Design a protein around this ligand. Structure first.
Ligand SMILES: *[C@@H]1O[C@H](CO)[C@@H](O[C@@H]2O[C@H](CO)[C@@H](O[C@@H]3O[C@H](CO)[C@@H](O)[C@H](O)[C@@H]3O)[C@H](O)[C@H]2NC(C)=O)[C@H](O)[C@H]1NC(C)=O
Ligand SMILES: *[C@@H]1O[C@H](CO)[C@@H](O[C@@H]2O[C@H](CO)[C@@H](O)[C@H](O)[C@H]2NC(C)=O)[C@H](O)[C@H]1NC(C)=O
Ligand SMILES: *[C@@H]1O[C@H](CO)[C@@H](O[C@@H]2O[C@H](CO)[C@@H](O)[C@H](O)[C@H]2NC(C)=O)[C@H](O)[C@H]1NC(C)=O
Ligand SMILES: *[C@@H]1O[C@H](CO)[C@@H](O[C@@H]2O[C@H](CO)[C@@H](O)[C@H](O)[C@H]2NC(C)=O)[C@H](O)[C@H]1NC(C)=O
Ligand SMILES: *[C@@H]1O[C@H](CO)[C@@H](O)[C@H](O)[C@H]1NC(C)=O
Ligand SMILES: *[C@@H]1O[C@H](CO)[C@@H](O)[C@H](O)[C@H]1NC(C)=O
Ligand SMILES: *[C@@H]1O[C@H](CO)[C@@H](O)[C@H](O)[C@H]1NC(C)=O
Ligand SMILES: *[C@@H]1O[C@H](CO)[C@@H](O)[C@H](O)[C@H]1NC(C)=O
Lengths: 322, 183, 195
């Protein structure tokens, strides 16, 4: 809010600020573009499907175990057990000192509502394979859908059935270690931590910034009139209104730069989830190191987290070829 | 004008343990917010009067002109207190307590009646609320419906196979350049 | 149908409309910007010369030179930002032309919704418009399937396709189209036993 932040609560504020023209209404038209865009980014990443599929009550997926990513009925929020660690590891009176017209609008999509979108992607990629993203959903057994994935790698399907028991145990043991790995080290979520820390720090520098005098005899507009002649008191406040307005310009230009990087990183996520999730990817080292098999999405505060599943060859032997 | 310092706000007593010398409380804001009155020997804590940003929900001008007003981050029972002469910059205090006020996380909007079914979003509000101009006519607020609920029957020995197909043509638009300007 | 779709609603070309709106809008706020006095006596330039003595009119004229000079930098900085998003969107358009048009794309949901076939480009003011042609499966009928088959004490697996049953006896068919075929050694291969 330009009027309140600059020199608000002064009858001589608005009229003197009025003659400067259309400055703060120029800035106001730039911080609403950022506000609108930040709601569109979430609409392209999570909202790529319409029918909200639901998982069957029975959970016998050919020996596989998916209890650590499916929605949890116990918690009131439809959040899986992996997401619980993610929410607790992001630490989102400093909010009350924003009386200077620096508000924080709420996001359009509530946290408990994005979880429904994520739960639809999972329930559509384990009962319908990958066809639900490119037409009508088609059910298929999971022990047979995997054989399609192995075919794409270049390994014939006759090896999956003969090793179904070993692969099932091997996959279940792999998903368990992800839960402990995230909690053990706090640097895993450093990508999300600085997104909210940088923004919060920028606000603090702006509020603390107005205490400067900028060459004026005093740093407060209220008391600068009772000690100096009103004939030229306009001169000192002019040195003050310009300096206060100029710093507001700097903060806006910073947000324009940051929003460009986020939009670049939003489209990259919107591309990974359209290929690594709704299909199989042949792009090497795009959906995780090794040959790609399938991916599952998980939500997080201001971001998304993937769990790529990859196939990596084990020990080998020398041979003579012709 | 306590202690010869001008300002504006409401006054409340605070329990901060002022030492026998210190007279003013201060924080990062660096704008006076607490005064020790020279009239008596108590502690006064100053906070700015209640304020907010006015947002107006309006349908098409030719369609109608009835509007619903939203105040961000204020208690819904606080806005009736604002109805006085020469207390608000606006004088349209008639909407302060009018139709059924519906409370949301981003404040409470007035002039809109809250249905409890769902539709598609027409005008976004915040925290999963949208408003539109539906049928004799009024502005309604609801909760977004993500989509039509669906269920897929999963069995371990059944497969679904298409027996037909269809061909569709889908468009797409991309900007490529803009005007060249010289000053 | 696509000809009527464009002519039905006028909101289709919104992305190519605000490109010219934004640049035309930033010029107007630039012309009106010089009307502000910037704390000087008057916005008119030459009159302040003939009204005030040259000894201190420099002070008045300086606060107006800086006021207009700062206005230009804000405009230029805006152009650099806007030129950044357009260039970041022309590379995407160039990539679409090299992959979707000149060839067939295996990247799911990149050159349309469905399985990609082939596309056509069309020109437009300050932009381009594509016409993706895709293949969408129609209605489906379920069946009963088995992973393999064992006839001579040895498991058999399909070469391409999956075994389906209609109730009486089994068949092999493609994944994306129901064309049942009689089970045959040419369509299968043998590996191991069936225990
Ligand atoms: C499942 O599919 C099989 C394979 O098509 C079906 O078996 C075949 O069904 C057709 C249609 O009834 C039979 O053709 C007719 O057979 C009669 C027999 O007298 C003949 O008189 C007719 O001129 C005509 O050719 C075909 O013989 C039969 N094949 C075999 C090996 O039995 C089967 O009916 C299908 N089951 C269901 C429930 O749809
Ligand atoms: C999938 O994995 C989970 C995680 O271990 C299994 O849940 C365990 O169930 C046993 C059985 O009583 C409990 O003793 C463990 O405490 C459970 N784990 C946790 C973390 O609470 C679950 O049983 C597995 N699914 C299947 C079908 O076995
Ligand atoms: C057998 O395979 C090994 C690799 O597994 C080949 O390399 C030998 O093993 C390691 C890996 O390089 C080296 O430290 C040895 O010195 C290698 N052996 C030799 C003789 O160089 C090995 O060459 C293969 N053997 C043959 C006969 O081809
Ligand atoms: C597959 O679907 C197409 C339409 O998508 C069907 O073609 C129609 O068939 C009916 C048969 O009575 C005709 O009256 C229509 O004119 C056809 N439409 C078109 C566009 O040609 C086709 O019949 C379906 N396949 C099968 C085997 O029924
Ligand atoms: C009024 O505006 C609407 C769009 O907001 C338009 O559809 C309608 O034709 C307009 N009516 C007029 C200009 O009479
Ligand atoms: C208003 O304040 C009361 C305090 O008891 C609280 O219970 C209520 O939820 C608040 N309502 C709004 C709309 O802020
Ligand atoms: C929904 O609203 C109608 C009136 O609009 C009311 O009769 C009904 O009881 C409500 N249902 C709820 C609150 O579950
Ligand atoms: C399918 O699941 C049911 C329920 O667990 C089980 O009784 C049946 O044996 C299973 N059949 C196959 C082929 O997996």
């Amino acid at each position: 809010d330009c009027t309140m932040y600059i020199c608000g609560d002064s009858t001589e504020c608005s009229n003197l600020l009025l003659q400067y023209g259309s400055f703060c209404t120029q800035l106001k038209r730039a911080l609403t573009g950022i506000a609108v865009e930040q709601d569109k980014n979430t609409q392209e990443v999570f909202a790529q499907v319409k029918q909200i599929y639901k998982t069957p009550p029975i959970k016998y997926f050919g020996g596989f175990n998916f209890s650590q990513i499916l929605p949890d009925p116990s918690k009131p929020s439809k959040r899986s057990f992996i997401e619980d660690l993610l929410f607790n590891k992001v630490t989102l009176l400093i909010c009350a000192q924003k009386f200077k017209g620096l508000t924080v609008l709420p996001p359009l999509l509530t946290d408990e509502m994005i979880a429904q979108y994520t739960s639809a992607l999972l329930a559509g990629t384990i009962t319908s394979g990958w066809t639900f993203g490119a037409g009508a959903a088609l059910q298929i057994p999971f022990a047979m859908q995997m054989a399609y994935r192995f075919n794409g790698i270049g390994v014939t399907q006759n090896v999956l059935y003969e090793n179904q028991k070993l692969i099932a145990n091997q996959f279940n043991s792999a998903i368990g270690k992800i839960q402990d790995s995230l909690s053990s080290t706090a640097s895993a979520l450093g990508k999300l931590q600085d997104v909210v820390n940088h923004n919060a720090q920028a606000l603090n520098t702006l509020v603390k910034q107005l205490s400067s005098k900028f060459g004026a005899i005093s740093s407060v507009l209220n008391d600068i009139f009772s000690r100096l002649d009103k004939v030229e008191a306009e001169v000192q406040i002019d040195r003050l209104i310009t300096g206060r307005l100029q710093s507001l310009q700097t903060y806006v230009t910073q947000q324009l730069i940051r929003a460009a990087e986020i939009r670049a990183s939003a489209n990259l996520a919107a591309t990974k989830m359209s290929e690594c999730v709704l299909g199989q990817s042949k792009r090497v080292d795009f959906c995780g190191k090794g040959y790609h098999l399938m991916s599952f999405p998980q939500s997080a505060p201001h971001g998304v987290v993937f769990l790529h599943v990859t196939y990596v060859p084990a020990q080998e032997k020398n041979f003579t070829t012709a | 004008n306590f202690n010869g310092l001008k300002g504006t706000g409401v006054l409340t007593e605070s329990n901060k343990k002022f030492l026998p010398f210190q007279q003013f409380g201060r924080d990062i804001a660096d704008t006076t917010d607490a005064v020790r009155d020279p009239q008596t020997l108590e502690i006064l804590d100053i906070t700015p009067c209640s304020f907010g940003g006015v947002s107006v929900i309006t349908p098409g001008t030719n369609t109608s002109n009835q509007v619903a007003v939203l105040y961000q981050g204020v208690n819904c029972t606080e806005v009736p207190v604002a109805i006085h002469a020469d207390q608000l910059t606006p004088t349209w205090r008639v909407y302060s307590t009018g139709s059924n006020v519906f409370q949301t996380r981003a404040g409470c909007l007035i002039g809109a009646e809250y249905v409890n079914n769902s539709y598609e979003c027409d005008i976004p509000i915040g925290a999963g609320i949208c408003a539109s101009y539906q049928t004799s006519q009024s502005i309604i607020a609801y909760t977004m419906s993500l989509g039509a609920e669906n269920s897929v029957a999963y069995s371990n020995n059944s497969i679904a196979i298409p027996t037909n197909f269809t061909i569709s043509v889908t468009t797409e638009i991309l900007p490529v350049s803009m005007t060249k300007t010289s000053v | 149908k696509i000809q009527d779709s464009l002519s039905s609603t006028a909101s289709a070309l919104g992305k190519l409309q605000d490109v010219v709106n934004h640049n035309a809008q930033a010029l107007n706020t630039l012309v009106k910007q010089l009307s502000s006095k910037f704390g000087a006596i008057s916005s008119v330039l030459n009159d302040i010369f003939s009204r005030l003595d040259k000894v201190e009119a420099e002070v008045q004229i300086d606060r107006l030179i800086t006021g207009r000079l700062q206005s230009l930098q804000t405009y230029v900085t805006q152009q650099l930002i806007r030129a950044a998003e357009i260039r970041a969107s022309a590379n995407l358009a160039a990539t679409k032309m090299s992959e979707c048009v000149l060839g067939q794309s295996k990247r799911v949901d990149f050159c349309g919704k469905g399985y990609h076939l082939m596309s056509f480009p069309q020109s437009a003011p300050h932009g381009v418009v594509f016409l993706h042609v895709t293949y969408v499966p129609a209605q489906e009928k379920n069946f009963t399937t088995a992973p393999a088959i064992c006839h001579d004490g040895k498991a058999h697996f399909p070469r391409e396709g999956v075994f389906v049953s209609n109730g009486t006896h089994w068949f092999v068919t493609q994944r994306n189209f129901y064309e049942p075929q009689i089970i045959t050694t040419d369509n299968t291969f043998v590996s191991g036993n069936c225990d």
